[PDB]
Structure formats: C-alpha cells, structure tokens
Amino acid sequence: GKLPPGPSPLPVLGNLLQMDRKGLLRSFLRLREKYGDVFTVYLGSRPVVVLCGTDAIREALVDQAEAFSGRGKIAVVDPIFQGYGVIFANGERWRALRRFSLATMRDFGMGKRSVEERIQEEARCLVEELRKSKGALLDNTLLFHSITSNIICSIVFGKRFDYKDPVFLRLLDLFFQSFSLISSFSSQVFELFSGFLKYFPGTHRQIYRNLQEINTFIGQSVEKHRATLDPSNPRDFIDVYLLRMEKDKSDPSSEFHHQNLILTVLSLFFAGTETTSTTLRYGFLLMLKYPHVTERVQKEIEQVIGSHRPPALDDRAKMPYTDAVIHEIQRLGDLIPFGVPHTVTKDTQFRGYVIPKNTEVFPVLSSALHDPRYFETPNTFNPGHFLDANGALKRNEGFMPFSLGKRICLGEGIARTELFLFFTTILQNFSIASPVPPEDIDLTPRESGVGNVPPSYQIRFLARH
Numbered sequence: 001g002k003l004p005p006g007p008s009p010l011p012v013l014g015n016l017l018q019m020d021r022k023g024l025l026r027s028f029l030r031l032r033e034k035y036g037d038v039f040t041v042y043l044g045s046r047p048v049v050v051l052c053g054t055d056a057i058r059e060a061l062v063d064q065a066e067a068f069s070g071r072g073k074i075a076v077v078d079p080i081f082q083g084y085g086v087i088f089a090n091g092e093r094w095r096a097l098r099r100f101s102l103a104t105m106r107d108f109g110m111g112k113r114s115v116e117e118r119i120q121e122e123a124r125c126l127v128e129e130l131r132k133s134k135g136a137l138l139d140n141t142l143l144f145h146s147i148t149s150n151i152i153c154s155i156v157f158g159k160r161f162d163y164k165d166p167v168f169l170r171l172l173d174l175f176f177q178s179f180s181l182i183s184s185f186s187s188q189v190f191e192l193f194s195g196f197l198k199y200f201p202g203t204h205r206q207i208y209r210n211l212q213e214i215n216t217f218i219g220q221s222v223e224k225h226r227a228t229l230d231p232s233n234p235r236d237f238i239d240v241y242l243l244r245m246e247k248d249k250s251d252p253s254s255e256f257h258h259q260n261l262i263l264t265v266l267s268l269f270f271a272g273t274e275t276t277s278t279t280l281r282y283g284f285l286l287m288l289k290y291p292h293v294t295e296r297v298q299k300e301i302e303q304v305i306g307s308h309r310p311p312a313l314d315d316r317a318k319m320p321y322t323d324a325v326i327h328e329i330q331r332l333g334d335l336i337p338f339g340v341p342h343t344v345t346k347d348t349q350f351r352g353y354v355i356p357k358n359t360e361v362f363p364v365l366s367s368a369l370h371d372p373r374y375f376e377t378p379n380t381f382n383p384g385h386f387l388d389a390n391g392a393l394k395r396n397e398g399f400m401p402f403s404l405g406k407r408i409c410l411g412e413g414i415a416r417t418e419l420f421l422f423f424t425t426i427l428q429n430f431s432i433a434s435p436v437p438p439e440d441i442d443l444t445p446r447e448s449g450v451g452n453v454p455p456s457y458q459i460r461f462l463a464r465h
C-alpha cells in the first residue's frame with residue numbers, strides 16, 4: 001500500500017541530512033512544510049510516521065483508536081523500562097496495568113482522603129511554606145517540583161514529605177536533573193543513533209543511573225509496605241497492588257509482578273511530577289507577563305470562593321475565566337511537543353497509505369495546540385480562545401494537551417485537579433511580582449525535546465490581606 005511521502009533516506013544516517021539542528025520538533029515541523037501533514041522520516045535506520053495538525057491526529061488516535069493504541073519507545077529511557085510499567089507496556093500487559101491504575105486512583109475507599117483532599121492539603125502546606133519566605137524573590141522550580149511529587153508520594157507511598165526533608169530533596173534532585181537531560185540536544189541525537197551511540201559514554205548513562213537510584217528507593221519502599229501490609233486496610237497504590245498479587249497467586253498469566261510494580265510506580269512519578277510542575281511554572285511566568293489576566297483570575301476567585309476558605313474542585317464549574325486561563329496555559333505551554341511515541345498494532349490503512357504493524361508513529365501535539373485551522377493567532381497567549389461571548393467556557397477540538405484515544409493521559413484527572421487547585425489557592429493567598437517588566441518576559445523554552453522545559457525566572461509571592 002506504501003508509506004506516507006518523505007525525504008529519501010541514506011543507509012545508516014537515514015534522514016540526518018534533512019533534519020534541523022534545533023531539534024526533533026523543528027525537524028518535524030520543517031518537513032511538514034515540504035511533505036504535508038502525514039509523512040515518513042528515518043531516524044537512523046528506523047522509519048517513523050509523523051502526524052501533524054489536529055485533523056490528522058484525530059483521524060488516527062480517535063477514528064482508528066485500536067490501530068494506533070501501540071506505544072513506541074524513547075531511546076534514552078527504554079533501557080530502564082524495556083516494555084514494563086504502565087506507560088511503556090503494550091498488549092495485554094498495558095491493558096491490565098492501565099485498567100488497574102485507573103481504578104486504583106479513581107477511588108481509594110472510605111476513611112482515606114480523596115485525591116482532591118490530598119491536593120488541597122498539599123496546597124495548604126505550600127501556602128504555609130510561601131508565607132515563610134515573607135515575599136522574598138525566589139525561583140519557584142524546587143517548590144513546584146515538590147508539591148506535584150508529593151501528590152504522587154501521597155498516592156503511592158501513603159504519605160507526603162516535608163519540603164526540607166533530605167531524602168526528598170535528593171530524590172527531587174535525581175528526577176529533575178533527569179528530565180533536563182532527557183529533553184537535551186544529546187538525548188535527541190541519541191534518538192537517531194541509539195543503536196550505535198548506546199555503546200559510548202554520555203548523558204544517556206547519567207539518565208540511566210539516576211532513574212535506577214530512584215527505582216532502588218521505590219524497591220525499598222515496596223519492601224517496607226510488604227513487611228507491614230494489613231490486608232484489611234490497604235494504605236495506598238503499592239498495598240493495593242500487593243493485595244492484587246495475592247489474589248492472582250494462581251493465575252500464571254497475571255502481569256502483576258515485581259518488574260511492573262517498580263516500573264509502574266516509576267511511571268507515575270516520572271509522568272506525574274514533571275509535566276504538571278512545568279505547566280505550573282510556565283503558567284506563573286505567563287501570569288507575570290499578563291498581570292491584567294492575573295488580576296481577573298483573582299477577581300473571579302474573590303467573587304466565587306472569597307478569601308477565607310480554600311478553593312475546592314467544584315468551584316471550577318463556576319469559574320470559566322480561570323478555567324479558560326488554565327486551558328490556555330496548557331495550550332501555549334505545549335509541554336509534550338511531539339507527544340509520546342505510539343506504534344500501529346497492525347498494518348494500517350491511513351489516508352491511502354499503509355503503515356506496517358509496529359511502525360512508530362509520532363502524533364505531534366504541538367501542531368494541534370498551535371493549529372491555525374483551530375486557533376486564531378496560535379502563537380499568542382489569549383484565554384479568549386476558550387471563552388464565548390458570554391464569558392462561558394468554550395471547547396476547541398484542537399485542544400489535546402493530554403493527547404487523545406486509548407492512550408490518553410492516565411493522570412489527566414489528577415493533573416487537571418492539581419492545576420486548578422494549586423493555581424487558585426496560590427493566587428487567592430498571594431499577589432505575584434518580578435523585577436522583569438511584562439514586555440520583557442521571554443516565554444522561550446530553556447530546552448525543548450520530548451518535554452518543554454520552561455526558563456528559570458525569579459518571582460515573589462506577597463501574602464494578601
């Protein structure tokens with residue numbers, strides 16, 4: 001049936017000569033200009049199909065959902081996962097882990113705190129910590145990585161860490177350094193010649209080393225959980241997984257074993273810590289660049305929530321402006337630019353082309369979030385993209401920051417609740433400022449690869465009264 005159009009490759013080097021030195025995303029966007037919304041490019045010797053624009057992505061991930069439900073690989077972390085854990089698994093193993101992960105977080109019995117309550121509690125701890133800074137200028141990177149890591153810790157380990165805990169800070173350091181390395185230029189070259197470059201020194205080794213040190217901490221927590229498990233009262237995600245292992249003792253095809261336990265927990269930290277945190281850091285940078293918008297969010301908080309009680313998730317339905325602002329922070333932040341690689345699960349017929357089973361497919365989410373066919377002046381921040389004439393929230397088919405289809409972000413619910421409660425609880429309690437004039441605020445990513453990493457910046461949180 002034939003593959004989608006694309007630059008003729010050279011053996012070994014593939015399409016290296018037709019790439020853009022800026023990175024994989026620019027390379028993909030440049031090729032889209034020449035070959036259309038659906039093309040083939042060779043990363044090293046591997047052929048991959050690229051889908052660009054809202055329409056093409058929706059046709060694949062939604063209209064042929066099952067076919068495009070396969071998961072590809074990211075070379076610098078594949079040595080860690082190797083097909084285990086809920087993110088990088090395929091087939092029955094993925095189906096089983098996803099179903100269990102959704103159900104285990106979608107509800108944690110009674111007597112325990114809901115996910116919304118754990119986030120409100122973390123937002124309260126955050127407010128207390130920021131009050132201690134007395135409004136001094138700071139870089140919010142560490143605290144924003146802390147609050148989102150703490151939500152996953154609460155869910156998986158059954159508790160949060162104090163912001164000044166040495167264990168926590170070390171773990172935080174390992175993770176953050178890894179995300180920066182993972183979307184660095186080197187990791188993107190590694191994506192092309194891993195088969196060859198895997199044999200040499202480099203950042204891919206430091207990434208591996210850091211993630212294994214985190215897996216070691218995960219393993220020791222699993223042992224502590226095992227040693228104190230009370231079947232009558234599971235405490236968190238690990239206890240629930242351990243109880244399922246007991247339930248499946250006689251099932252030789254169960255996927256609930258050790259490797260999927262450690263790597264599913266790593267998956268939830270990997271995914272649950274990084275993107276929500278960078279979205280929040282990018283959102284506050286935009287709020288410094290658009291003080292008028294920040295002021296309107298604070299006015300809506302005052303009208304709907306007031307200044308005494310904490311924001312609750314059900315306030316969001318009565319706060320369309322703030323909700324539109326968060327949508328727009330996600331849309332312009334474009335935190336996972338070329339998506340997380342998929343693969344087709346069978347030879348697939350797509351737009352008159354044939355995509356062979358297991359071929360890697362990149363749904364370039366950035367090209368939908370910035371799709372001119374759906375968003376006027378896509379490169380400019382405007383909450384109005386999500387608001388109708390009456391100020392009510394409006395949907396846009398191009399808005400797919402969590403992707404779409406069978407692989408749609410498993411943590412979407414948790415992430416949206418974290419964005420709404422952290423953004424509103426911070427702005428209800430603090431006004432923000434920085435020495436940089438709004439006009440001079442640069443939104444350009446410090447690094448752009450599988451993740452977009454926002455630039456560092458200074459900000460102050462002044463307690464309100």
Ligand code: HEM
Nearest residue numbers: 087271272275276279336340401402403407409410411415
């Ligand atoms: C603003 C925050 C977040 C954004 C924009 C985001 C978005 C994404 C995207 C674009 C994908 C790939 C979907 C695909 O394969 O097509 C993904 C997958 C995933 N995300 Fe997130 N994510 C966020 C937060 C979270 C959180 C908080 C968790 C965990 C609690 C999480 C868990 C996962 C997992 C486990 C997958 C793989 C799902 C599967 O393969 O079935 N994410 N996310």
Ligand SMILES: Clc1ccc(-c2cnc[nH]2)cc1
Nearest residue numbers: 074087270271272275340450
């Ligand atoms: Cl390689 C990779 C995989 C998954 C994510 C992710 C999912 N949800 C948030 N982040 C990011 C990068």
